[PDB]
Design a protein around this ligand. Structure first.
Ligand code: B7P
Ligand code: CA
Ligand code: CA
Ligand code: CL
Ligand code: CL
Ligand code: CL
Ligand code: CL
Ligand code: NA
Ligand code: NA
Length: 326
DNA sequence: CCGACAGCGCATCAGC
DNA sequence: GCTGATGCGC
DNA sequence: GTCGG
């Protein structure tokens, strides 16, 4: 947190651009700048020193100068005073409400938490769940609880079919002391890039986790991605644990390494790596790394036996999960 | 200057 | 119903 | 908002 003030500032600017201006590239520009500053190993003394880093240009440099000179940013001070921007920003904190729905609600006079509750009839299913657990989803999850949740998920999945493999990814796999939510990568040998030999492979796992009252709500569910809500069991007389977001991703077993690289993140790390892959003439998604030909069209999947192979292909030295927290 | 900015699953909608 | 675009989230 | 060519 050497430059926490600056990275907080840029993050609030990124959120503004995404939520209020709907300017997704400004949002990504501010987030990249915040990311590169967060790993800079010195206390930044001036915007000119900051402009040296890639992704910090003239505009951000000047903002950093204002922030360093005064401790604040007038442009953010104004955004914070504007009722409509602040309302739009707030409503996007509910899961399922993005910038478009947020502005639509605010334009209808739905501006507060109370307003959402009073108008729950106007929400789709995802939004209603996001509102139900709004307070809970704000909380982080300590790693000790993540370890208990891991124990439950892996054991319940073994009970369904011992050939499943569940891997907890995201910030947990990167070694974080607390996580925003739980990400579970699932494989099974009957589901490969070649064939699906069994149906309902994800459904059964979700069904088992519902049966033991671990999963409590479904935000969305298809054949390969589940997004819902879970909760640790509590003891006699104990306050209940907060409800937690859980994401489950069933990946073809032969594409495990691209899948776990994707799901381990961070999102910014993935964006840097995939951008770099493009520069080196490849494209990476959660399934494959493919070469781009002269026309820039994806060719056939390259062979991959490890996370490190993906790094090797784009001529990056290997970075362990804990060093991917960008 | 100016294109290019990572990649994609699921829910919902308009249009057929 | 399907297809393609859009919103949303990871 | 930033920047490589
Ligand atoms: O845009 C994205 N792209 C993108 O590849 N992923 C990938 C990378 C990310 O680690 C993983 C899970 O997403 P989270 O939103 O759960 O991110 P965490 O890094 O786990 O942090 P937290 O501790 O839960 O807050 O999906 C997320 C995106 F959101
Ligand atoms: Ca997570
Ligand atoms: Ca997640
Ligand atoms: Cl933009
Ligand atoms: Cl400020
Ligand atoms: Cl793979
Ligand atoms: Cl692919
Ligand atoms: Na720079
Ligand atoms: Na939201």
């Amino acid at each position: 947190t050497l430059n926490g003030g600056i990275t907080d500032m840029l993050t609030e600017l990124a959120n503004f651009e995404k939520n209020v201006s709907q300017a997704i590239h400004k949002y990504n520009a501010y987030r990249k700048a915040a990311s590169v500053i967060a790993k800079y190993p010195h206390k930044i003394k001036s915007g000119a020193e900051a402009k040296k880093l890639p992704g910090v240009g003239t505009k951000i440099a000047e903002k950093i100068d204002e922030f360093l000179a005064t401790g604040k940013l007038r442009k953010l001070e104004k955004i914070r005073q504007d009722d409509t921007s602040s309302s739009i920003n707030f409503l996007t904190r509910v899961s399922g409400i993005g910038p478009s729905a947020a502005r639509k609600f605010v334009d209808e006079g739905i501006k507060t938490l109370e307003d959402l509750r009073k108008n729950e009839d106007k929400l789709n299913h995802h939004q209603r769940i996001g509102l139900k657990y709004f307070g809970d989803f704000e909380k982080r999850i300590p790693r000790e609880e993540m370890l208990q949740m891991q124990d439950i998920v892996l054991n319940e999945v073994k009970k369904v079919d011992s050939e499943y493999i569940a891997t907890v990814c995201g910030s947990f796999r990167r070694g974080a002391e607390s996580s925003g939510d739980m990400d579970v990568l699932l494989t099974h040998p009957s589901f490969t890039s070649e064939s699906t030999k069994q149906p309902k492979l994800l459904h059964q796992v979700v069904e088992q986790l519902q049966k033991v009252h671990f999963i409590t709500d479904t935000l969305s569910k298809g054949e390969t991605k589940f997004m819902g809500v879970c909760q640790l069991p509590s003891k006699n007389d104990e306050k209940e644990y907060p409800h937690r977001r859980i994401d489950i991703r069933l990946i073809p077993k032969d594409q495990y390494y691209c899948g776990v690289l994707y799901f381990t993140g961070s999102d910014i790390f993935n964006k840097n790596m995939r951008a770099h892959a493009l520069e080196k003439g490849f494209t990476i998604n959660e399934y494959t790394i493919r070469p781009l030909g002269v026309t820039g069209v994806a060719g056939e999947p390259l062979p991959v036996d490890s996370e490190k192979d993906i790094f090797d292909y784009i001529q990056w030295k290997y970075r362990e999960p804990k060093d991917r927290s960008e």
